[PDB]
Amino acid sequence: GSPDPEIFRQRFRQFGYQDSPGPREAVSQLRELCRLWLRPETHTKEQILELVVLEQFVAILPKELQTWVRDHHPENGEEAVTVLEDLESELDD
């Protein structure tokens, strides 16, 4: 199949300004990388916004929680929260 969304998201964030001959080209390449992650041909506005939120949520998690969440390959913010809440539940019981 095609690459996992996370490969696309990383390529979008890892593209470097000196990778293209000038700003017009850089902006064109970024657009193309961003479409391949956020997939506007298949996702609604709401689904896109959810992926943008999820990315930032992962970015701000303390390291140990971040690794755990990452390993669960979440596709939205609810999935990310529930895998932390599953630990917390099992500790509170």
**Residues lying near Cl ion in the complex (CB under 5 A):** 28
Query: Is 91 a residue that touches its own copies (CB under 8 A)?
Result: no
Q: How far is CA 68 from CA 19, 37, 53, 71, 83, in A?
A: 32, 22, 18, 5, 8
Per CB under 8 A, contacts with its own copies among 49-68 are 49, 52-53, 56-57, 60-62, 65
Residues that bind Mg ion in the complex, under the rule CB under 5 A: 22
Residues that bind ligand EMC in the complex, under the rule CB under 6 A: 31, 34-35, 38, 49-50, 53
